[PDB]
Structures are given as C-alpha cells and as structure tokens.
Amino acid sequence: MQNKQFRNKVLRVLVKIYMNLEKPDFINVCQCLIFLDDPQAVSDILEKLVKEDNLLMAYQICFDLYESASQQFLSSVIQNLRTVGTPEPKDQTLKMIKILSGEMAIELHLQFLIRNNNTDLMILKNTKDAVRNSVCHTATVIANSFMHCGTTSDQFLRDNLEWLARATNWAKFTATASLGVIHKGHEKEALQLMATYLPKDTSPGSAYQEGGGLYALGLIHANHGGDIIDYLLNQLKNASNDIVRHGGSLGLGLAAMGTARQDVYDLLKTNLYQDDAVTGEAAGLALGLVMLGSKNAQAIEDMVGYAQETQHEKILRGLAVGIALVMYGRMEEADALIESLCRDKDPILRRSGMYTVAMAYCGSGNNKAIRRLLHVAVSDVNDDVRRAAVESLGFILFRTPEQCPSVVSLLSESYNPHVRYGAAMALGICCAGTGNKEAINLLEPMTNDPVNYVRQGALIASALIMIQQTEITCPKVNQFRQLYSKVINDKHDDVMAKFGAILAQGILDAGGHNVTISL
Amino acid sequence: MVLESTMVCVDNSEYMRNGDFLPTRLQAQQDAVNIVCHSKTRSNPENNVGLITLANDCEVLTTLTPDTGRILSKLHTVQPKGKITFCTGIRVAHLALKHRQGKNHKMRIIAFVGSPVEDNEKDLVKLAKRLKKEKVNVDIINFGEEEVNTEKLTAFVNTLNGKDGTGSHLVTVPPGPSLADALISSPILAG
Amino acid sequence: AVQKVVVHPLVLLSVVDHFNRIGKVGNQKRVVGVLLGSWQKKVLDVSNSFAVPFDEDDKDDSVWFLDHDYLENMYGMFKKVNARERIVGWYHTGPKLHKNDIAINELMKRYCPNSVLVIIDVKPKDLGLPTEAYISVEEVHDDGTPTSKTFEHVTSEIGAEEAEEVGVEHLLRDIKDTTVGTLSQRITNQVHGLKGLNSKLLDIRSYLEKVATGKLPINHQIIYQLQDVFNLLPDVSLQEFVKAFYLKTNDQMVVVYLASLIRSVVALHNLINNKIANRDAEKKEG
Amino acid sequence: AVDTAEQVYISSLALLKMLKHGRAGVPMEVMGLMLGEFVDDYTVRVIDVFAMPQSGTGVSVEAVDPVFQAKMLDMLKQTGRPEMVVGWYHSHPGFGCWLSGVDINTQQSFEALSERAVAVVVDPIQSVKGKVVIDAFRLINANMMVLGHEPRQTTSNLGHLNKPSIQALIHGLNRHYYSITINYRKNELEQKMLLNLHKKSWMEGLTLQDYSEHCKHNESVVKEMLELAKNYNKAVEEEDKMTPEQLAIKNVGKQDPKRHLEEHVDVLMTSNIVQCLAAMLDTVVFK
Ligand SMILES: [Zn+2]
C-alpha cells in the first residue's frame, strides 16, 4: 500500500540495472511503466530500439504500451516517436508507422471473433416470447446487441422491420445505439450503412435514427486514430432538436476522449449554456470524457458554480459525472476538494464527491476515505448517498475479491432496500471476472425478497459472476435454474423484475462466451 | 388612448376656510378633482386615480384605482389637521409610483398647495434635482397665498422642469371671487 | 391582557417565501406582512397570513407604503373562504426596530384593533427563539416622559395543532422526538452552555458599551432591577444546603443500587446462555 | 405522438397549504388551484397554492367563477407572483381518493389549456398521523387504448411509486386512470430555518428555564415515579424468583413472549436522569 512518494524513486533507480546486463527484460519495464508514467524513463528505451537493430522484440512492448497503461502519455509519446527519425531509414519508417497504428488488433479480433460465433435459437426465441411493448423492448435489443457484439450480425435484425420501428419513442434510439454496439470498427461501412437506410429525401420523420447514428458513430470510432471528428463539428454545427445535441454531444465526446481539446470545451460550454438538462447531461458526460487528465482551472469552479444556480437534476448528475471522471491521479490534490465539497447541501453533489473520489483513489492507496464513505453510507438519512456510496468502496477495493464480502456481507441484507441494491452492485463490480464463492454462497438470500430492487441487483450481481465459469468446478445449477425460471415466471413478477431478469440473462450470452470483461 | 397614472394631493390645513376667498373652496377643488377624474375617465377609463394628503402623518386615503365610486365617498372626512409637509409629501407618492398595476402608465402627479412652504432653497434644489433626475411629470398648483406668489418657486420650476419640448406647465391662479375650475382647466394638463 | 401567544411555523415559512420570491433584485428590505390570527380567545393563535407591497426610502426613514384596498380584498376573500380567522396585526422581517414602526403600526392601531409586533432575523443565524410578541400598548413612565407607544415583550411558543407536526417531521426525516434517555439529555447538557453563552455574551458587550458610551436615556430605571436581580444571589455559602446535597446524593445512591442490581439481574440470561449454548453447540457440533 | 418521463416537484409550500386545507377540509366538496412555471417538457414546479370558497354544488365547472379566478390571478400578477396556473386540487373524504365522472369531466374541460393538468387529492381524514405520503393523479388519452398505455421511460421510480399499493384503487380502477411519482426539494434556508425552528419548537425560550424545574423536581415528583418504578421492578422480580425453576427444568424453547430485559433497561434510562442532572445542579450551585 505505497503512497507513491518513494515507489517512483525505487523504481526509477532499479530500472538502471537491467540495461547493463546481457539482455533486457520486459516484465520490469512494463510493471514499472504502468505505474511511474514518467517521460524521462521512456526516452532511452525508445531510442535504443534503433541502436539494437532488433525488430521482433519491439513489437511486444509497442503492442502493450500502445495498447494500455496510458492515454495522454500515448498522446505525447506518439509525437515523441514521430519527431524521432526521418522528417535503416526504409525500415524505421514502416516500423514507426506500424507500431502506433493499432488497427491490427481490431483486424485480428474482428477475424477470430468473426469466425468463432455460436448462436442458439432458444435464447432469442425466448426473448421474442417474453418481449413486451412497454419496458423490456430496450432489454431485448440491448441483449441482442450484447450477444451480437463485434460479430456485426445484422441478419438477426433483418428478419422484419415491424418489431423495431413499431413505436415512436426512445426504443428506436436504444435499438439504433444497440446496433452501434453490434458493429464496431468500420470507417466506410458505418457511415455508409447508416446512410443507406433512407437515402431518398434526407429528412427522417423520427430524429432518433440520426441521434442514434451520431451516438452509434461515437461508439464505433471510440479511441480510434482515424476519427471523423472534423466532420462531426460541421455536422454538429447544424441546428436540430435534442438529437444532434444529445447524440452528437455523446458521440463527439466519446470519439474525442482524451484529446483535451479546447474546441470541444468551447462548443460544449455554448451547448450547455441553454440551461437544458438533457444536452447539459450529455454535455457533462462528454466533458468528463474529453477532460481525462486535462484538469482545467476554471472548469471545476465554473461547473460547481453552474450547479447550484439551476433547479434541474439531470444537469446536476451530468455535471456530477463530468467533474467525477475528470479526477484521475489527483490523490495528493483532491483532498481539500473532496473534503470541502463533501459537506455540500445538495445530495446529488454529495454523491458527486464519492463518485469523484472513487476513481481518484484507485489501487487501495487510501484507507481514510472509507471512513467518510461508510460514515455517510450509514450515518446519512438520505438513501441517495447510501446506495451511491459503496460504488467508491468497490472501486477502491477492487484489488482483493476476498476481503469485500467480509465487509459488505452486512450490507447484503441491510435495513432499507437501497443499501441492499447498491451493495448488490458492489458485489457485482468487486468480484467481476473472478471465481470467489464468498459472494456466490450469499447470492441465494439476495434473490428471494418481496422487494424488486434486491432481486434486480441480485440477478445483475449473479450475472456478473456466472460469466466465464465452468460447471464442473462449482455447482452453479442453483443460480442457473433460479435465473432461468425468471423469464417463465415473469407473469407473476413485477414489470421491472423481468427487465432486469432478461437484462441479466443478456450478460452471460454476450458475444457467445467469447468476449469477457476485466477490471 | 393615453396610458398614465393620476395622483392628486390636497391640503388639509385650516388655511382653506378663509372668508376672503371662495366659500370653503375645498368643495370647489373637490369638484375639480371630480371633473378631471371624470374627464380622464371619459378619455381613458383605464387610468387610476389616487388620493393622499400632505399633513405631517401622511395617510394613503385611496389606492390607485379607476373605480371612483368609492373615491367619491373617500373625498369626505378630510380630517383638517396639520399645516404643511413637503418632503414626505413628495416622497410618499413619487417613490410609491412603482406600486401601480400597469407598468406602461406614465408618471404624473399633481398637488394642491394651500400653505406657505417651510423648506429652504436647499430642499427645493435637492428635491427638484431628484424629481428631474427620475423624470416624473410634476404639476405645481398653488391655491391661496400670503407672501409674494413666485419668488423662489420660479427657479424651482425652471430647474425642475426638464424636457422643454411638450413638457410640464406651471399653474398660477390669481386672486378673485370667480371659480378656479375654468382657470386650472386652461392648460393642456386638464383634458 | 394577553399572557402568552401561539405562533405556527407557517407564517415563518411564508417569510421563507418572502425570501424566495425576491428575484435577485438587490433590495431585501424589511418586507411587512399582515399577520392574521384569532383575537377572540385570550390566547393568540396564528394560523396563516399574507403579504402587502411595502417599500421604504433610502435616506428618509419616515417613508412607509401600505395599501387599504389590497388588505380589504385579501381580508374579504380570506374571510369568505375562512371566517374563523380575522386580522390581528402585522410583522416585519427587519432585525432593527426603527422609529417609523409607530407610524406603520399606528394605521393598524386606528383602523384595526391593538396589533401585535414580531421582530425576526433575515438570516437564520440567531440561535435564540426568532419570534418575540411585542404588544402595542401605551404605558405610563415614572420619570415624566410623554406617553408614547411601548413594545412590551410577550412570551411566545412554536407549536402545531394537528398536521404541521406530521408535515415537518416528514419533510425533515433528520430531527428526533423527545426520546427521554441518554443522548437527548446529554446533548442539551453539553450545548446549553453555548445556548446561554452566545446570548448572554452577545448582550453584555453592547450592554457594557452603552453603559459608558450611551446617551438618549434608555430607561435606566430598569437597570436597577437588572443588577438587583443579578445580586439576588450574593454567593451563598451553601451551609444550609449541605443536607440537600445529602438528599440528592442519597437519591444518587438509590440510582447506583438500581443500576448495579438491575444490571445484575440482566446478567442472568447472558451469563447463562453464554455457557449452556456454547457447551451444547460445541458438544453437538460434531 | 410523443411522451416523456415527467415528475412533479413538491415543495413545503403546497404541502403545508394542503395540511391547513386538509384541516379545513370539511366533508363538503372543496376547490383549489395550483400555480407554477413551465421550464421544459418533462418537469413541473408548483410554488403558489391557495384555497377556494366552498359551495353547495361542490366540485364542478359551474362553481369556478372566471371573474374571481382571473381577478385573484391578476392580483397575484400585480404582486411578486409571476406564475401561471398549473392545475387544480381538491379533497375526497370517506369514499376514497378515486375520481368520479364529474371530476374527470371537469378535468377534461380544465385540461384544454394546460397539457399536463396536474391533479392532487389530499385526504387526511382517515389517514394516520404516522405517514403523510400523498399521490398525484393524471389523465390518459382515450385514443391510446390501441398502443401502449403509458410508454414512460425511467421505470426505476415505479418502485417508489408502488408504495400506495392498495389492492382496489390502483388496479381496481387502473383502467384509463394512472398516477405519477412525487419528489421533494429543500434548500439551505428551509433546512437551517426550519430545522432550527423545529429544534427551538422543542426547546425552551432562553434554553435555561425548564432545566432546574426537572433538576429540582427529581426530589419532589420523580421520587414517586422511582417508588412506583421499584414497585414494578419487584412486581417482575416476584416472577423472576419463579423463573429459575422452569429454566432449571426444561431449558428448551421459549413460551413467554415477554423479554423482561429491555423494560428494565428502560427503567434504568428513566433512572439515569438523576445522574445526568446531578452535574447540572453542580453547575447551577457552582456558578
Ligand atoms: Zn363525495
């Protein structure tokens, strides 16, 4: 549980020993460069690649360092390596071009993921048998988007058009966005596929197709180097009703995530200056995404100054997540900010302090924030910070999956169902991708209760643990049978219980058991 | 038609019952208020007319309203106390002009002065500077006198009257047994 | 005439509305509201109230603006919908007692019956009771000063009859009831010293200031009764009260015997189940 | 053909006006009018709420006087109340909070101007003083019987709307008759002014008056409560002398629902007043 005051020095002084050996190792430079993130520690290893004249060994370090562990350090190292070289000359050019490409991973993932798909008619037929026109309509298309993610299998949605556009509401927006979740990583078939739907008059009666086209386009071009943002500014400049602003703001902010450009900040501010809650919520999410690591001076004070001067709540949650995602790496900085903003009169901003300090203290590096996290989770009377408090506890304690049920097992069956629901999300996020049974043996008391909150959160928490697990290792027949009986028992259950039931069933069938999740 | 507010201030001192002038001219100027309020009613019935005195303890007799049916009853029981009060007499109406219902109605306040002024020239130039500053139409009507008619009130009006183009007019009535209605109805302010 | 009054929080929350519908104009002066209540019974009971446009002048304090037509219309419609409550007086939100209040209250003294006056604070920073009933009655002074309007303090209480307690308790969900016991008592026994310390300490400063640096006689006659009541306890030697300390200490001994004996009775089920349950669960566990 | 997720904002103004209006809520049918401001599509805020004079006819379109309504609304427009009406409220005592044909007819006639037409019915007559949870009513379109009934998004708040779960009105008359969720809002001025006002409502004037009353009544009146408390203590110990026989015979199962412990703990809590106020008398005697 280092405090980063000496770990960076010990690492930066211990990385000088392997370069003097007969051959350099990758586990130490990776396991150090994932934490220190110092520019002076990469300038030597980026220039020694030319001196060593070894092409095979650089592909791995380029693949993983350009893969993860940094976003803005990659945004700076791409021009650091772009400056080095020509403004083996013929080989270093194709090397430096092909190392920062990043599309080869999308090609191979699209390849094996395009030839490993396995679909069954029982699941989709069961969804069509249990589909409702009111609530679970979005659950069916989001489950179909989960199971058909990456495989670009639109033939399932090419069967008929009377099942998607039968109602003019947000269901078509969730269906088009779900289609954006289906196919991803397309520079021509994306815009061409969206334009081929109605290339007759260029005036759709339902703007949810355009909003879902911009949001889906942002889902497709997320973290890509071939962004169409330049065209997204000329397309976003057009005046439209709550679809170019919302969908265009979400897609533009997601595509421009990590760029920290002042242009999207200016147009985003003038887009939120209309006092609207929807475009201010989407503008808050987009601003939080694009401000990853920027830490602008006047932005925080301008948003917290804009918070209490309005009555809507969607603007307070949009700016809440906006100021929550911007806080990254400010362990030694956000102390007075979170400590000062923790005693605010607004419960929404009170949740914004916990969500803000959640990602700031990742790695279980601070055991002091849990004092006020659980102190406000138990002491406060409003259930908002009570159900929204433990998400920070899981976000800071996601390292050890065994230590979580020992302290949240009391919150499994709490006094009010709100702490039971938020605690169910805590068990869902803390043990995700693992195989710890300390929550699985406690899932049985969670799934039987007259309140639908703990039942929904119990089905989601069980759906986040049953993924990527074999039956011969642990007897999952209990939760498989009691979870499969929810779609046949939905007639005697609540309207939302079947929504979270089939929505939980869409997690296991996501990608046909090929793709999983990892924290 | 014309959208403006009408405010009249009548004197309640004992100087209005002298036998040399009209026989208790309070009823005569009451009929003057009647013919100007009924005249403005015939021109535009949406105009509101208020009633207030200039005594030491100023009391709002009638709120600004076009309904004169109860104003006719409020014109009685004048309570003839006090002699004169100018500062809070101006401030009691010119500052209360913001309490009117219609914001489009112009500001117009008249006053019946039946007693000699007790304020010095400094209060005349300060209050005149305030009235000229806020740009409120002020009509000065002086009934009865003891000293010379206009000695400092001339400079008071000349320094108070702004916007010389179709601005305010001064009403000076000479002594005489004839009625004052036809004399005060001569300027354009009446009708 | 009136010994005590009853003021419901609905009128003070109507003052919260007076501070809500301002509109950020920058005036926030002493908005005068027309207080309503039941003057029939000897005790005064405020149910609700309304407002009247009131504006003063910056320099001149004697300027006051009221309205008779709006008062007769609000009183006529309010009396038509509820004839059980009539006009009683008025109230201002200004923390300072200005001289113009005799002219403002004099109107409701002539037209209306004897009006009660209530001074509150614009900012909820005063720890004391914000409501003070000040009756408008003329009292004869001994020094020979002319008879003028005197504001005598009448005690007040903040209580709700049927529903406002339920509404306030539902909207708060943080305040606690009486709950006789340890916490509700020890909180009062801890913070009461500040509850008297801020008031008395806040008063003795302006008091001692106006003692030496004071003019415009403030009825110094009452100060003789002030220091007299302050000297009604001339540091008693506690010689006679020793037996009373023996009585209260004897009751303390009774509480000691009740605590030790009763807790000793409570220790039965615990100090028995801890053995019979652990030994049987252990001998029968495997 | 479009619908959103609306939510009615309820402050303490309309709540307290419905509490006093509920106290004056005679069995005769009453009338009321709500005001507010429309900022967007899916939110509504109520600020001004007043009462209406009762009539022998009751809740009807003929009882609503247009010159009286427009007159009072004009008198509110000349003052610092620039808010337009948002709906009308009433009370349904005895026969339940459901709406009859006349109420839905005058609601259909009164909803021609405002598309929202918020309707709230307070009934504190048979409602216990423990909860004051109120519910807002809405009107559905008659042409929506072919399509879905309520295509409202954000189905999370329906769990909070399921608190009024009466098995006769909700689904006993759910056809062509639905409801909407209700939330509250409180600023710092209501929190500190109302919180300190309620604490002061449960406190003293100078906060030092009624302390010595109990501190000195511990020797006069509380002694009787201590002697009677010991009489109940002995009245339980006379059976506690018989408890070790059964506890010494069976030791299996519990038959007496009485705990005999928390009551004595409460007696100790009432007895600790002497200990807690002894230091108070020490401070009054000391200084
Ligand atoms: Zn009835």
mmCIF file of C-alpha atoms in Angstrom, chain A residues 235-388:
data_model
loop_
_atom_site.group_PDB
_atom_site.id
_atom_site.type_symbol
_atom_site.label_atom_id
_atom_site.label_comp_id
_atom_site.label_asym_id
_atom_site.label_seq_id
_atom_site.Cartn_x
_atom_site.Cartn_y
_atom_site.Cartn_z
ATOM 1 C CA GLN A 235 -22.391 18.102 -38.756
ATOM 2 C CA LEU A 236 -22.866 19.129 -35.111
ATOM 3 C CA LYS A 237 -22.955 22.829 -36.053
ATOM 4 C CA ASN A 238 -26.382 22.287 -37.641
ATOM 5 C CA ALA A 239 -29.364 23.293 -35.512
ATOM 6 C CA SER A 240 -31.526 20.314 -34.531
ATOM 7 C CA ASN A 241 -33.934 19.304 -31.767
ATOM 8 C CA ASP A 242 -32.291 17.376 -28.914
ATOM 9 C CA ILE A 243 -30.693 14.717 -31.169
ATOM 10 C CA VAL A 244 -27.613 16.407 -32.636
ATOM 11 C CA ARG A 245 -27.012 17.996 -29.224
ATOM 12 C CA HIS A 246 -27.541 14.824 -27.180
ATOM 13 C CA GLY A 247 -26.391 12.118 -29.588
ATOM 14 C CA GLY A 248 -23.869 14.395 -31.268
ATOM 15 C CA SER A 249 -22.505 15.529 -27.910
ATOM 16 C CA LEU A 250 -22.177 11.964 -26.603
ATOM 17 C CA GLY A 251 -20.632 10.669 -29.826
ATOM 18 C CA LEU A 252 -18.326 13.670 -30.183
ATOM 19 C CA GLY A 253 -17.172 13.469 -26.569
ATOM 20 C CA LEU A 254 -16.651 9.709 -26.739
ATOM 21 C CA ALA A 255 -14.712 9.975 -30.006
ATOM 22 C CA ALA A 256 -12.658 12.893 -28.629
ATOM 23 C CA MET A 257 -11.984 11.177 -25.289
ATOM 24 C CA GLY A 258 -8.505 12.005 -24.013
ATOM 25 C CA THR A 259 -7.809 14.707 -26.606
ATOM 26 C CA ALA A 260 -8.350 17.551 -24.088
ATOM 27 C CA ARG A 261 -9.050 19.922 -26.979
ATOM 28 C CA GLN A 262 -10.266 23.422 -26.150
ATOM 29 C CA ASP A 263 -12.605 23.403 -29.167
ATOM 30 C CA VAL A 264 -14.934 20.742 -27.748
ATOM 31 C CA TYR A 265 -14.692 22.631 -24.449
ATOM 32 C CA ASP A 266 -15.871 25.887 -26.041
ATOM 33 C CA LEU A 267 -18.636 24.388 -28.187
ATOM 34 C CA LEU A 268 -19.589 22.167 -25.246
ATOM 35 C CA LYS A 269 -19.924 25.208 -22.971
ATOM 36 C CA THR A 270 -22.010 27.078 -25.540
ATOM 37 C CA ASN A 271 -24.050 23.871 -25.885
ATOM 38 C CA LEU A 272 -24.726 23.721 -22.131
ATOM 39 C CA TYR A 273 -25.438 27.469 -21.846
ATOM 40 C CA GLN A 274 -29.065 26.848 -22.912
ATOM 41 C CA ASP A 275 -29.935 25.650 -19.363
ATOM 42 C CA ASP A 276 -31.337 22.396 -20.776
ATOM 43 C CA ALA A 277 -30.958 19.282 -18.647
ATOM 44 C CA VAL A 278 -30.613 16.686 -21.423
ATOM 45 C CA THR A 279 -27.941 18.404 -23.527
ATOM 46 C CA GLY A 280 -26.333 19.503 -20.264
ATOM 47 C CA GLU A 281 -26.238 15.914 -19.026
ATOM 48 C CA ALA A 282 -24.815 14.614 -22.308
ATOM 49 C CA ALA A 283 -22.504 17.637 -22.388
ATOM 50 C CA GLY A 284 -21.430 16.741 -18.854
ATOM 51 C CA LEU A 285 -20.615 13.162 -19.829
ATOM 52 C CA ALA A 286 -18.783 14.335 -22.953
ATOM 53 C CA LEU A 287 -16.849 16.964 -20.995
ATOM 54 C CA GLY A 288 -15.871 14.386 -18.383
ATOM 55 C CA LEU A 289 -14.695 12.053 -21.140
ATOM 56 C CA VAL A 290 -12.678 14.643 -23.077
ATOM 57 C CA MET A 291 -11.207 16.182 -19.897
ATOM 58 C CA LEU A 292 -9.462 12.933 -18.893
ATOM 59 C CA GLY A 293 -6.220 14.232 -17.395
ATOM 60 C CA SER A 294 -6.703 17.847 -18.503
ATOM 61 C CA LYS A 295 -7.624 19.323 -15.088
ATOM 62 C CA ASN A 296 -8.616 22.788 -16.262
ATOM 63 C CA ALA A 297 -8.556 25.555 -13.664
ATOM 64 C CA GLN A 298 -11.782 27.427 -14.458
ATOM 65 C CA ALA A 299 -13.710 24.291 -15.477
ATOM 66 C CA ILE A 300 -14.258 22.873 -11.980
ATOM 67 C CA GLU A 301 -15.201 26.236 -10.464
ATOM 68 C CA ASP A 302 -17.398 27.017 -13.480
ATOM 69 C CA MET A 303 -19.268 23.710 -13.188
ATOM 70 C CA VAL A 304 -19.687 23.842 -9.407
ATOM 71 C CA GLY A 305 -20.762 27.456 -9.880
ATOM 72 C CA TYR A 306 -23.246 26.315 -12.533
ATOM 73 C CA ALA A 307 -24.576 23.527 -10.286
ATOM 74 C CA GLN A 308 -26.436 25.380 -7.521
ATOM 75 C CA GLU A 309 -27.797 28.071 -9.883
ATOM 76 C CA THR A 310 -30.231 25.658 -11.579
ATOM 77 C CA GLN A 311 -33.181 23.530 -10.489
ATOM 78 C CA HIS A 312 -32.989 20.529 -12.839
ATOM 79 C CA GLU A 313 -31.427 17.278 -11.631
ATOM 80 C CA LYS A 314 -30.181 15.834 -14.935
ATOM 81 C CA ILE A 315 -27.813 18.800 -15.228
ATOM 82 C CA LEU A 316 -26.548 18.125 -11.692
ATOM 83 C CA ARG A 317 -25.920 14.447 -12.440
ATOM 84 C CA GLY A 318 -24.386 15.270 -15.821
ATOM 85 C CA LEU A 319 -22.005 17.797 -14.292
ATOM 86 C CA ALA A 320 -21.624 15.381 -11.366
ATOM 87 C CA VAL A 321 -20.197 12.630 -13.567
ATOM 88 C CA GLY A 322 -18.449 15.364 -15.554
ATOM 89 C CA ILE A 323 -16.476 16.504 -12.511
ATOM 90 C CA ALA A 324 -16.237 12.881 -11.349
ATOM 91 C CA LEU A 325 -14.445 11.398 -14.366
ATOM 92 C CA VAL A 326 -12.071 14.369 -14.691
ATOM 93 C CA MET A 327 -10.477 13.469 -11.327
ATOM 94 C CA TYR A 328 -7.689 10.996 -12.120
ATOM 95 C CA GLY A 329 -4.289 10.833 -10.449
ATOM 96 C CA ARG A 330 -5.150 13.651 -8.008
ATOM 97 C CA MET A 331 -4.568 11.595 -4.845
ATOM 98 C CA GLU A 332 -2.448 14.364 -3.303
ATOM 99 C CA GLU A 333 -4.628 17.110 -4.849
ATOM 100 C CA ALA A 334 -8.320 16.209 -4.427
ATOM 101 C CA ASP A 335 -8.045 16.025 -0.620
ATOM 102 C CA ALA A 336 -9.278 19.567 0.030
ATOM 103 C CA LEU A 337 -11.616 19.390 -2.974
ATOM 104 C CA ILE A 338 -13.474 16.247 -1.891
ATOM 105 C CA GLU A 339 -13.190 17.133 1.803
ATOM 106 C CA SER A 340 -14.569 20.627 1.147
ATOM 107 C CA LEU A 341 -17.294 19.557 -1.306
ATOM 108 C CA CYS A 342 -18.326 16.608 0.892
ATOM 109 C CA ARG A 343 -20.395 18.777 3.268
ATOM 110 C CA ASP A 344 -22.476 20.331 0.475
ATOM 111 C CA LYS A 345 -26.220 20.738 0.952
ATOM 112 C CA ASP A 346 -27.021 19.063 -2.378
ATOM 113 C CA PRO A 347 -27.361 15.254 -2.145
ATOM 114 C CA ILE A 348 -26.566 14.972 -5.863
ATOM 115 C CA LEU A 349 -23.249 16.765 -5.369
ATOM 116 C CA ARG A 350 -22.754 14.696 -2.210
ATOM 117 C CA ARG A 351 -22.891 11.649 -4.477
ATOM 118 C CA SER A 352 -20.613 13.521 -6.892
ATOM 119 C CA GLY A 353 -17.938 13.743 -4.203
ATOM 120 C CA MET A 354 -17.987 9.980 -3.669
ATOM 121 C CA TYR A 355 -18.086 9.155 -7.386
ATOM 122 C CA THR A 356 -15.339 11.746 -7.895
ATOM 123 C CA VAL A 357 -13.110 10.284 -5.162
ATOM 124 C CA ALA A 358 -13.862 6.760 -6.426
ATOM 125 C CA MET A 359 -11.602 6.809 -9.490
ATOM 126 C CA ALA A 360 -9.131 9.148 -7.762
ATOM 127 C CA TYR A 361 -8.149 6.603 -5.077
ATOM 128 C CA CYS A 362 -7.907 3.519 -7.301
ATOM 129 C CA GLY A 363 -5.477 0.854 -6.142
ATOM 130 C CA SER A 364 -6.481 0.774 -2.445
ATOM 131 C CA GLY A 365 -3.958 3.517 -1.700
ATOM 132 C CA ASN A 366 -6.063 5.437 0.838
ATOM 133 C CA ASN A 367 -7.734 3.866 3.875
ATOM 134 C CA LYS A 368 -9.016 7.245 5.129
ATOM 135 C CA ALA A 369 -11.711 7.919 2.516
ATOM 136 C CA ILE A 370 -13.593 4.781 3.593
ATOM 137 C CA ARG A 371 -14.183 6.442 6.980
ATOM 138 C CA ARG A 372 -16.432 9.084 5.410
ATOM 139 C CA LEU A 373 -17.672 6.707 2.692
ATOM 140 C CA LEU A 374 -19.164 4.257 5.185
ATOM 141 C CA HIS A 375 -19.783 7.088 7.662
ATOM 142 C CA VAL A 376 -22.061 8.764 5.115
ATOM 143 C CA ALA A 377 -23.393 5.375 3.983
ATOM 144 C CA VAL A 378 -24.659 4.544 7.488
ATOM 145 C CA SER A 379 -24.975 7.938 9.194
ATOM 146 C CA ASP A 380 -26.780 9.919 6.485
ATOM 147 C CA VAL A 381 -30.557 9.577 6.276
ATOM 148 C CA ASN A 382 -30.916 10.135 2.513
ATOM 149 C CA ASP A 383 -30.650 6.882 0.558
ATOM 150 C CA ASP A 384 -29.005 8.590 -2.439
ATOM 151 C CA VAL A 385 -25.503 8.717 -0.960
ATOM 152 C CA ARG A 386 -26.281 5.432 0.818
ATOM 153 C CA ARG A 387 -26.854 3.426 -2.371
ATOM 154 C CA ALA A 388 -24.361 5.541 -4.356
#
